[PDB]
Amino acid sequence: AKSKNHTTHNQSRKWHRNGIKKPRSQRYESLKGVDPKFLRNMRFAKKHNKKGLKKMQANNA
């Protein structure tokens, strides 16, 4: 009752039977695990450019 231990035989042609895929790297990646002091700044910079911007830029635009 001794058997066969480990092969990678037949595994290369079934990896390609559905064809190994790049995960397509879309625009706008997530900010999952950016360092927190940088991220905590960057949403303070996103909640004041929506308020205190669009009178002194709409003239310049």
Binding site: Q11, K14, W15, N18, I20, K21, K22, P23, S25, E29, G33, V34, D35
Partner: protein
């Protein structure tokens, strides 16, 4: 069976090459990495803290995070039947700037300055590159002398 331990098959690759030991030079630390920079991974052996893993040594990824002493790199890694984008935190001594895009960033420079260089002059420069063509019908010269006759030499031990 086969010892699934970190830093396993690295007798030669986490080793300083030959006669380049000692404390590491300082322009390595004076390298500036921004987001989206394309860096290539090469774990050294003197600095012990932020070596990635032997899975990534030799590979090339993109910066998404910049820290005080390290850089967050997304690399593609081959697991069995699919690849995955893995984000690995590597200290700054184990990476460097990859020149792999810098032959494309030269010919977006010398392409756009040459695109408008013919727009002002009205030609058809065809700035798209072709691979090595078959050779031109040239005309060799054998001036004066004669083509030297060579013959296969005999056998000796």
């Amino acid at each position: 069976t086969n010892t699934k331990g970190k830093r396993r098959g690295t007798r030669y690759m986490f080793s300083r090459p030959f006669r380049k030991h000692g404390v590491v030079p300082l322009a390595t630390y004076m390298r500036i990495y921004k987001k989206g920079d394309i860096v290539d991974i090469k774990g050294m052996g003197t600095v012990q803290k932020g070596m990635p893993h032997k899975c990534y040594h030799g590979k090339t990824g993109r910066v998404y995070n910049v820290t005080q002493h390290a850089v967050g790199i997304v690399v593609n890694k081959q697991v069995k039947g699919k690849i995955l984008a893995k984000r690995i935190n590597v200290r700054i001594e184990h990476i460097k700037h990859s020149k792999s895009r810098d032959s494309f960033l030269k010919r977006v420079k010398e392409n756009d300055q040459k695109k408008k260089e013919a727009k002002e002059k009205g030609t058809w420069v065809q700035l798209k590159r072709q691979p090595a063509p078959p050779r031109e019908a040239h005309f060799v010269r054998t001036n004066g002398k004669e083509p030297e006759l060579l013959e296969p030499i005999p056998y000796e031990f």
